[PDB]
Amino acid sequence: PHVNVGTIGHVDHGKTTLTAAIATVAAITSGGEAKDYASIDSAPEEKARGITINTSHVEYDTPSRHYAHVDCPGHADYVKNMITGAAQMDGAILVVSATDGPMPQTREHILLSRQVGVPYIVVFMNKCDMVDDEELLELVEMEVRELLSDYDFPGDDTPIVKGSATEALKGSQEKYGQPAVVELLNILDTYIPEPERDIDKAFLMPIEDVFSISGRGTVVTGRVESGIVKVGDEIEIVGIRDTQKTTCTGVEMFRKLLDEGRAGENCGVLLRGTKREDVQRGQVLAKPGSITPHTKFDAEVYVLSKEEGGRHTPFLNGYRPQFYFRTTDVTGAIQLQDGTEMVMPGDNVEMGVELIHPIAMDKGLRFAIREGGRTVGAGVVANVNV
Amino acid sequence: MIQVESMLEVADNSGARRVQCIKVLGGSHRRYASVGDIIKVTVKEAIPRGRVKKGDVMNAVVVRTKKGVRRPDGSVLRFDDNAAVLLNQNKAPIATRIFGPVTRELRGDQFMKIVSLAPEVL
Amino acid sequence: KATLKSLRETKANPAVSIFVKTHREHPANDQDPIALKNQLKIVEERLTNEFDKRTATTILDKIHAETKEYNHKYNLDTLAIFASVDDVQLIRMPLDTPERVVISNRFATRDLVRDMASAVHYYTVVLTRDKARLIEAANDRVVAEFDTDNAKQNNMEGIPFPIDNNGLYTTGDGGSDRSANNENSYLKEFFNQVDKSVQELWGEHKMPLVIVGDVRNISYYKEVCDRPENIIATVSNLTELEDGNAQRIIDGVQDAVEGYRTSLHEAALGEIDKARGANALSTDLQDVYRAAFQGAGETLYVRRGYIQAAKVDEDAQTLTMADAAADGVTDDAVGLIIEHVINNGGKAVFMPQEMMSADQPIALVTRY
RNA sequence: GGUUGGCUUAGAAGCAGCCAUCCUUUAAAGAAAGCGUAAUAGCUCACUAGUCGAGUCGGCCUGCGCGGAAGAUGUAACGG
RNA sequence: GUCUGAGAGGAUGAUCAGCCACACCGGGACUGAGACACGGCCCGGACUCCUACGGGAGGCAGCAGUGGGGAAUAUUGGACAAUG
């Protein structure tokens, strides 16, 4: 199996050093590779979807499953990676320095994980080799537990493991080194449940092109991004218009029928009864009741600074840009909260959005904010309202 | 061997009946167009209520010539008419049916739907 | 007071602007009195609801005294009424605007601004094989004709207009009899001299020029012109080039003058793209309002006929969308943008509907 | 340092433009000779002190030179 | 026959019944008591489809139904229990 993980926390707390530590320790039994610190600290920059991110993509595997490990060399890089969702992390290794643990970077990182929808956080504290005492370590543990509880995370039942990344790289068998990274791997292999597959999720398929075939009905094309669609499956059309019922009467690709339409492939699907003008690009096909349309929602929005292309001017309440949801752009009006009138570029906060017409969304969906074709920010849905 | 002011039969389902070469494309003083060569034509006779009106100026590809096309073994391959297939503004076939045979010099990437729809590909 | 720069000056409260669609000929102009009265009804009911009956029934009588004596057969494209207490101005303009009533502090002069922005001042060079004329024109009318009593010709060193082609071959004197076939070179050098006179007059006032004549005449002129980048259009199908009136030629160049005005709007698309790529272009309505209000607006690009009502308060500079335009909002929120951009030394360009997108109807090139 | 001189201007903060050239800590520092900014910001300069140590700086006139200086049969504008 | 009209007339020819003609378009016949044959043959054609490019297949104006056209007209039902 495959799982995506990453180290979050305050700068200088040893996230990169710890990532190298797991790399080298997983290199035992050749599962990983002895990884140099500098190579991973030199994260390449990719300007994907008009957004530039420094991310170091570390990879390694265990007898349990393979891990995709994510590291960023700065707070802006971490925020961009979470919100643009280059690789959704279903598990986060909160790196806490044994001294000065709960810094504001960790403060905002935990909240960002909560908003973007990271389901599980595993706490690891490093720099224990610089700390000779025990009761301040316990105080730091209590602080991080309380902070996790403060943002809907378990906290009390959150596994906390203690060690030192420098000792792990050195090779010392002292409990704060290799043994520490070894348990940390154990919690990674046990506490983190196996993530759901795309083909195992509920069926969903955004509609990109609407056809019609004589004798067959209405054909809508698009890449199925979850579940499976088969002839005889009851499906519903959700999006711009009000939800309509239909039934699958055929799945075809290149004018040839398929046994079923699986997630990840650009299959076309036939609809029963629906007309060529009763459905349009932007709507999605979903299992009945799996998703619902909404115009008002609250999202974690990162405003691109001018350095990423971005935008010269700040966001403000009443700004109404275009919002892009997987196949379509829709005008939404930015609605800030009390005490947020000005929203500086390069920052990230939670805003409410009111779309001009409903879009099939649910918590965790990601979208781009643009005007004139220039990306001015990225976002992720954190709550939907009616 | 098609040159300017030479009439060509239309070998596709485009509505044109006869076209006249008004330019041999691909060179400053290029004289002749054989099979596979792109020419500029004016449609001289068209079918009523068709895709192409009489008097349009557009692109065509030569698909068979009366002079003939040579093969590597030295053989020549001659036809009884000079025929063309009308093309798009980006030099792509606008045909859903091809009439008569075409030669195998149309193999490539841009004249593939002309070879697949041809009744016979020599 | 019937000008743009008196209506921008006057600050009444309330200041009523009424726009009525009228027609130039009969029987189309038969519904002009009805449309005028219909607009006066909505504005009279708006004033009695917004301020009071007394203000409504003094403003309405002030405009009724003016509109009582109205022919309605000499109507232009629109009838604009600018009214207040103790003042009513009645101007007919040749532009097409949608019927609206604007009640605000200002006098809703966005269409006057848009008509002043669509104003071409050019030269008309009239070429024949026999003579040459020069007409200086402002839009549809001629400013002058460059006669021998024009006085912009006083201190000239070239031949002044009208320029007779009195070359040696035209009269038969000199040499080089017809068999040498130098007629083309004689015409080319005569048009070179005509262009010398044109350039000597242009250097003093630098307007664009339209070239009018036969195809071969204007082509010979384009061969020979010393500054061929100042030419905007050539018109070869104009008639009566020697005896014709100066106005008559100006009439025949109108299609070319409008084609040039359309080209000057297609060329603004590249300016908008340059602003967008330099991150100096604001397109949100609230963004454009803020930028224009704090003096950052360099050029405003407004789609033709784009009107929007919004709740504007400049103390906090928040332009929220209106609901019914009956709650105390500003009727023309985009006309307020146009006024602020003109106030802060900017330009407003009113872009036609087929070059500007319907969904992105406004675009402001900012100063930073 | 008063000080973003005053005015004007969307902005005019030494440096768009118009009217003065003031005072203070001074060894010295212009209500600024340039670059830069939308305006600020920022980098210089004038000026002063320090280091090194002997001549140096800029105008005027005169003579002879340099560039400005591209054509058609062949060098081809000292006859060679 | 139907509507109308006092009638004479006028208009009309859905559903029911009789007769006729047609069965993607043109032509020829075969077999048979009976056809120049709605879900048969042959040839030709237009269109649609399959193909390994050599070749092949098909005809809802039967009943459901689809796309399309339209102002507008229905179920992709059950049974041979009854009359045939």
Ligand SMILES: Nc1nc2c(ncn2[C@@H]2O[C@H](COP(=O)(O)OP(=O)(O)O)[C@@H](O)[C@H]2O)c(=O)[nH]1
């Ligand atoms: N002694 C000790 N030093 C550490 C440990 N982890 C990190 N460091 C030091 O802290 C520095 C910064 O940590 P780093 O991994 O770069 O943090 P990041 O850049 O935010 O991911 C590194 O260069 C290490 O030298 C640790 O566990 N023990």
Ligand SMILES: [Mg+2]
């Ligand atoms: Mg790092």
